[PDB]
Write an enzyme that holds these catalytic residues in place. Structure first.
Site, mmCIF file in Angstrom:
data_model
loop_
_atom_site.group_PDB
_atom_site.id
_atom_site.type_symbol
_atom_site.label_atom_id
_atom_site.label_comp_id
_atom_site.label_asym_id
_atom_site.label_seq_id
_atom_site.Cartn_x
_atom_site.Cartn_y
_atom_site.Cartn_z
ATOM 1 N N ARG A 133 -7.837 -8.235 -3.245
ATOM 2 C CA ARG A 133 -8.282 -8.841 -2.005
ATOM 3 C C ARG A 133 -8.107 -10.343 -2.048
ATOM 4 O O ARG A 133 -8.512 -11.008 -3.011
ATOM 5 C CB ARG A 133 -9.736 -8.466 -1.714
ATOM 6 C CG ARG A 133 -10.330 -9.177 -0.513
ATOM 7 C CD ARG A 133 -11.716 -8.672 -0.217
ATOM 8 N NE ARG A 133 -12.610 -9.777 0.122
ATOM 9 C CZ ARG A 133 -13.932 -9.669 0.240
ATOM 10 N NH1 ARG A 133 -14.534 -8.496 0.055
ATOM 11 N NH2 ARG A 133 -14.655 -10.737 0.550
ATOM 12 N N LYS A 150 7.955 3.433 -0.410
ATOM 13 C CA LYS A 150 7.115 2.282 -0.073
ATOM 14 C C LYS A 150 5.672 2.491 -0.549
ATOM 15 O O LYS A 150 5.040 1.556 -1.046
ATOM 16 C CB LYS A 150 7.141 2.007 1.426
ATOM 17 C CG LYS A 150 6.339 0.777 1.846
ATOM 18 C CD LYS A 150 6.610 0.451 3.296
ATOM 19 C CE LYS A 150 5.744 -0.689 3.770
ATOM 20 N NZ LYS A 150 5.835 -0.827 5.237
ATOM 21 N N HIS A 167 1.416 0.994 -3.958
ATOM 22 C CA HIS A 167 0.146 1.603 -4.357
ATOM 23 C C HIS A 167 0.081 2.312 -5.715
ATOM 24 O O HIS A 167 -1.011 2.682 -6.145
ATOM 25 C CB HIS A 167 -0.378 2.539 -3.256
ATOM 26 C CG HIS A 167 -0.607 1.857 -1.940
ATOM 27 N ND1 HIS A 167 -1.558 0.877 -1.764
ATOM 28 C CD2 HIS A 167 0.005 2.004 -0.744
ATOM 29 C CE1 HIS A 167 -1.541 0.471 -0.508
ATOM 30 N NE2 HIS A 167 -0.591 1.129 0.128
ATOM 31 N N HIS A 217 0.711 6.519 3.084
ATOM 32 C CA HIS A 217 -0.210 5.428 3.397
ATOM 33 C C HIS A 217 -1.465 5.557 2.540
ATOM 34 O O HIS A 217 -1.921 6.669 2.276
ATOM 35 C CB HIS A 217 -0.472 5.474 4.919
ATOM 36 C CG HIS A 217 -1.770 4.881 5.382
ATOM 37 N ND1 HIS A 217 -1.918 3.539 5.671
ATOM 38 C CD2 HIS A 217 -2.946 5.467 5.716
ATOM 39 C CE1 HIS A 217 -3.147 3.315 6.102
ATOM 40 N NE2 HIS A 217 -3.790 4.471 6.139
ATOM 41 N N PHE A 218 -2.015 4.425 2.101
ATOM 42 C CA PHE A 218 -3.311 4.399 1.428
ATOM 43 C C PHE A 218 -4.405 4.084 2.447
ATOM 44 O O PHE A 218 -4.420 2.990 3.023
ATOM 45 C CB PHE A 218 -3.342 3.361 0.291
ATOM 46 C CG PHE A 218 -4.546 3.512 -0.617
ATOM 47 C CD1 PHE A 218 -4.463 4.283 -1.767
ATOM 48 C CD2 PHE A 218 -5.768 2.927 -0.287
ATOM 49 C CE1 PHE A 218 -5.568 4.454 -2.603
ATOM 50 C CE2 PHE A 218 -6.884 3.090 -1.106
ATOM 51 C CZ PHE A 218 -6.787 3.863 -2.269
ATOM 52 N N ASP A 219 -5.330 5.020 2.676
ATOM 53 C CA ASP A 219 -6.278 4.831 3.781
ATOM 54 C C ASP A 219 -7.557 4.122 3.349
ATOM 55 O O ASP A 219 -8.010 3.193 4.040
ATOM 56 C CB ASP A 219 -6.612 6.155 4.487
ATOM 57 C CG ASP A 219 -6.999 5.956 5.949
ATOM 58 O OD1 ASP A 219 -6.250 5.263 6.666
ATOM 59 O OD2 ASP A 219 -8.038 6.513 6.397
ATOM 60 N N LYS A 252 -0.433 -10.283 1.830
ATOM 61 C CA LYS A 252 -1.065 -9.037 2.271
ATOM 62 C C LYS A 252 -2.540 -9.154 1.890
ATOM 63 O O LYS A 252 -2.848 -9.383 0.729
ATOM 64 C CB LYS A 252 -0.410 -7.800 1.638
ATOM 65 C CG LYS A 252 -0.829 -6.483 2.296
ATOM 66 C CD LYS A 252 -0.130 -5.257 1.704
ATOM 67 C CE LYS A 252 -0.686 -3.982 2.340
ATOM 68 N NZ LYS A 252 -0.371 -2.712 1.580
ATOM 69 N N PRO A 253 -3.442 -9.064 2.879
ATOM 70 C CA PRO A 253 -4.884 -9.300 2.704
ATOM 71 C C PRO A 253 -5.609 -8.366 1.716
ATOM 72 O O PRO A 253 -6.420 -8.837 0.914
ATOM 73 C CB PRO A 253 -5.449 -9.099 4.115
ATOM 74 C CG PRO A 253 -4.294 -9.257 5.027
ATOM 75 C CD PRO A 253 -3.108 -8.753 4.280
ATOM 76 N N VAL A 254 -5.347 -7.064 1.804
ATOM 77 C CA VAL A 254 -6.006 -6.069 0.944
ATOM 78 C C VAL A 254 -5.008 -5.001 0.506
ATOM 79 O O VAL A 254 -4.256 -4.470 1.329
ATOM 80 C CB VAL A 254 -7.283 -5.402 1.615
ATOM 81 C CG1 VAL A 254 -8.288 -6.455 2.098
ATOM 82 C CG2 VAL A 254 -6.912 -4.468 2.757
ATOM 83 N N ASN A 255 -4.990 -4.693 -0.785
ATOM 84 C CA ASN A 255 -4.077 -3.667 -1.309
ATOM 85 C C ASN A 255 -4.631 -3.006 -2.555
ATOM 86 O O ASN A 255 -5.133 -3.687 -3.448
ATOM 87 C CB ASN A 255 -2.705 -4.265 -1.628
ATOM 88 C CG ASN A 255 -1.663 -3.202 -1.976
ATOM 89 O OD1 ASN A 255 -1.249 -2.424 -1.115
ATOM 90 N ND2 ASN A 255 -1.212 -3.190 -3.232
ATOM 91 N N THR A 256 -4.513 -1.681 -2.625
ATOM 92 C CA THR A 256 -5.040 -0.937 -3.753
ATOM 93 C C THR A 256 -3.924 -0.343 -4.613
ATOM 94 O O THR A 256 -2.959 0.191 -4.080
ATOM 95 C CB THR A 256 -5.973 0.179 -3.263
ATOM 96 O OG1 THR A 256 -7.034 -0.409 -2.500
ATOM 97 C CG2 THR A 256 -6.556 0.956 -4.443
ATOM 98 N N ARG A 285 5.795 1.800 -4.332
ATOM 99 C CA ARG A 285 5.902 0.374 -4.602
ATOM 100 C C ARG A 285 4.572 -0.333 -4.341
ATOM 101 O O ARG A 285 4.144 -1.170 -5.141
ATOM 102 C CB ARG A 285 7.018 -0.258 -3.757
ATOM 103 C CG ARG A 285 7.096 -1.762 -3.879
ATOM 104 C CD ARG A 285 8.281 -2.342 -3.146
ATOM 105 N NE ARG A 285 8.288 -2.045 -1.709
ATOM 106 C CZ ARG A 285 7.684 -2.778 -0.776
ATOM 107 N NH1 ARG A 285 6.972 -3.847 -1.110
ATOM 108 N NH2 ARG A 285 7.792 -2.438 0.499
HETATM 109 C C1 LIG Z 1 -9.404 -0.105 3.019
HETATM 110 C C2 LIG Z 1 -8.117 -0.241 2.218
HETATM 111 C C3 LIG Z 1 -6.951 -0.531 2.906
HETATM 112 N N1 LIG Z 1 -5.735 -0.686 2.225
HETATM 113 C C4 LIG Z 1 -4.586 -0.950 3.127
HETATM 114 C C5 LIG Z 1 -3.105 -0.776 2.802
HETATM 115 C C6 LIG Z 1 -2.616 -0.882 4.258
HETATM 116 O O1 LIG Z 1 -2.441 0.427 4.809
HETATM 117 C C7 LIG Z 1 -3.829 -1.523 4.976
HETATM 118 C C8 LIG Z 1 -3.456 -2.415 6.159
HETATM 119 N N2 LIG Z 1 -4.144 -1.868 7.335
HETATM 120 C C9 LIG Z 1 -3.243 -1.951 8.500
HETATM 121 C C10 LIG Z 1 -4.175 -2.012 9.725
HETATM 122 C C11 LIG Z 1 -5.552 -2.388 9.159
HETATM 123 C C12 LIG Z 1 -5.285 -2.731 7.694
HETATM 124 O O2 LIG Z 1 -4.553 -2.162 3.895
HETATM 125 C C13 LIG Z 1 -5.671 -0.517 0.826
HETATM 126 O O3 LIG Z 1 -4.618 -0.630 0.206
HETATM 127 N N3 LIG Z 1 -6.863 -0.222 0.134
HETATM 128 C C14 LIG Z 1 -8.079 -0.085 0.832
HETATM 129 O O4 LIG Z 1 -9.107 0.172 0.209
#
Ligand SMILES: Cc1cn([C@@H]2C[C@@H](O)[C@H](CN3CCCC3)O2)c(=O)[nH]c1=O
Length: 124
Positions: A85, A7, A12, A119-121, A41-45, A10
């Protein structure tokens, strides 16, 4: 069944481009990696480095995760990444995204045996 490691790959990994990532990139990539299926999905890298290089981050600089867990690791080197984003006018199922390329250190959470990114933090 999709493992956590799978996952992460896929969601990241995009080693196929160095990042010439067009303005189109995030609209295309968020869709094809199935990140617009149940919602936008709001934000993804996406990381544009080898899988070996990203996996190796699990043995790099240990930093606190945003959720307070201790299993996060920051890359010693900057990496080519693309942040995706959601725009304001984006409405599911037509998910729209701003594509931003940057060179930054990545922070990932690692788990398992083998110890791999799950996970991507953040990027810093
Ligand atoms: C800050 C940041 C967050 N994300 C992540 C992927 C996923 O783990 C996260 C969703 N989080 C889940 C709880 C808060 C938001 O968006 C990214 O993929 N890139 C970023 O720079």
């Amino acid at each position: 069944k999709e493992t956590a490691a799978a996952k992460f790959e896929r969601q990241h990994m995009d080693s196929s481009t160095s990042a010439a990532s067009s303005s189109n990139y995030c609209n295309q990539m968020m869709k094809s990696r199935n990140l617009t299926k149940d919602r936008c999905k709001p934000v993804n890298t996406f990381v544009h480095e080898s899988l070996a290089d990203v996996q190796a981050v699990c043995s790099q600089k240990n930093v606190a995760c945003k959720n307070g867990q201790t299993n996060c690791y920051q890359s010693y080197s900057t990496m080519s990444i693309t942040d995706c984003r959601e725009t304001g006018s984006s409405k599911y199922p037509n998910c729209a995204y701003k594509t931003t390329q940057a060179n930054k250190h990545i922070i990932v959470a690692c788990e398992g045996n083998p110890y791999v990114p799950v996970h991507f933090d953040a990027s810093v």
